[PDB]
Design a binder for this molecule. Structure first.
Ligand SMILES: Nc1ncnc2c1ncn2[C@@H]1O[C@H](COP(=O)(O)OP(=O)(O)O)[C@@H](O)[C@H]1O
Ligand SMILES: [Mg+2]
Length: 399
């Protein structure tokens, strides 16, 4: 196996992309290092899959071995990483201020905005890990229905962070809160999109009243890339709904300029550049990655395999429905057209107006439709269905 050795000076990162067709393994052999905020263990081997784009950064100096074929691999000497540490430091300062003023203290809340392909998701992950290493437990909030890191696409979601992200797998998806939007773009149904992120904010505000540690943890919030026309108005509305203290704008000067003139004055607005390590993606790449996220939901990861169940469900044992004039519930008659679509298990026990704003237990995928036998085959994370009310998503997946 072909090997590449890299010496990283303090404040440098090894940026690499796995080949189109192979894994790459990483081992820290001396010193200290981290990947998007999680500390590496000395002499532990970390294995990454094809087309991964990764950076391993060190604060003190490290020597790192890479095993396998790479499409690119270089050490960058200039990064925005101190910018992110300082965003973390400022958040923890706000916690301690509010803790002594409450002797319960409420943690700070941060909104990340900008167009697609600027490193927005990655920055969210760094900030979450730094909070955990400090002894704190933050809440991560995901509003990108096109590229979601907590649940399936076409969702808005949130999760309590109690341990640093796994280097390969990201954050433990241990009991998230999840809502189904059912399209990849907010422009498909603008008024529904806005209604869902409002309900998310309301739900989280009630949860933290029962957990002092999560309350003081605070929130880190990832947005979609729609910044023009009606997308602009969407950004302003999310900032008010989550009562954010801080807005971080990545790489859009007209947007930063326009928002400085509209946001309330107490909101701290910071423009930051995108990392030189972020590459432009195309229409086909995002669509492809949506498929891969769906696969993970059911089957898990290499390190922690999930073992999903495939079983049949009678149409008499469930109710199928679709949202959307724009935000009305419509009951679906099973047809050949639902094949390949995701459906959410609503926490609502009936197919009501309450379906619209209820979170979900999780999802299934409709793999087959037998119109004559009146059954469908589904893929499901647990042995029996957690709910009888199934909600349509326009997201399709060929499994
Ligand atoms: N410093 C970096 N070096 C190398 N790759 C990076 C770096 N930061 C982010 N990436 C990669 O670039 C891609 C795009 O980043 P992402 O955070 O998903 O962008 P956005 O959320 O703005 O669309 C991801 O594969 C991510 O892992
Ligand atoms: Mg993103």
């Amino acid at each position: 196996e072909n090997v590449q050795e890299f010496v990283l000076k303090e404040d440098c990162e090894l940026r690499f992309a796995a080949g189109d067709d192979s894994d790459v393994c990483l081992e820290l052999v001396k010193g200290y290092a981290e990947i998007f905020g999680t500390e590496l263990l000395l002499n532990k081997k970390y294995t990454f899959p094809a087309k991964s784009r990764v950076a391993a950064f060190t604060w003190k100096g490290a020597t790192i071995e890479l095993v396998g074929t790479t499409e690119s691999a270089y050490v960058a000497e200039s990064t925005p990483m101190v910018i992110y540490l300082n965003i973390h430091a400022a958040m923890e300062e706000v916690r301690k201020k509010r803790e002594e003023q409450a002797a319960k203290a409420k943690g700070p809340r941060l909104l990340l905005v900008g167009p697609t392909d600027v490193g927005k998701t990655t920055v969210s992950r760094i900030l979450c890990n730094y909070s955990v290493r400090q002894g704190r437990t933050p809440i991560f909030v995901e509003l990108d229905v096109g590229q979601n890191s907590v649940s399936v696409p076409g969702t808005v979601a949130a999760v309590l962070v109690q341990k640093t992200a796994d280097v390969i797998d990201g954050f433990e998806r241990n009991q998230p809160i999840v809502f189904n939007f059912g399209h990849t773009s907010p422009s498909a149904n603008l008024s529904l999109y806005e209604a869902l992120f409002k309900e998310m904010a309301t739900t989280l505000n009630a949860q933290i009243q029962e957990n002092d540690e999560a309350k003081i943890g605070g929130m880190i919030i990832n947005t979609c890339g729609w910044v023009d026309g009606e997308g602009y108005k969407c950004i302003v509305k999310a900032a008010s709904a989550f009562e954010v203290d801080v807005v971080i704008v990545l790489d859009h000067e007209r947007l930063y300029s326009d928002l400085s003139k509209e946001l309330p004055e107490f909101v701290r607005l910071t423009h930051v550049p995108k990392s030189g390590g972020v590459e432009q993606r195309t229409g086909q790449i995002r669509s492809k990655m949506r498929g891969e996220n769906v696969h993970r939901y059911f089957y898990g990861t290499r390190a922690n395999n999930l073992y999903p169940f495939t079983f049949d469900v009678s149409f008499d044992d469930v109710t199928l429905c679709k949202i959307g004039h724009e935000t009305k519930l419509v009951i679906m008659e099973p047809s050949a057209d639902i094949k390949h679509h995701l459906f959410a298990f609503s926490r609502s026990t009936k197919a009501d107006e309450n379906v619209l704003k209820s979170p979900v237990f999780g999802f299934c995928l409709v793999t087959e439709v037998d119109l004559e036998k009146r059954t469908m085959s589904i893929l499901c994370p647990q042995r029996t269905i957690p709910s009888k009310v199934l909600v349509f998503s326009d997201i399709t997946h060929l499994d």
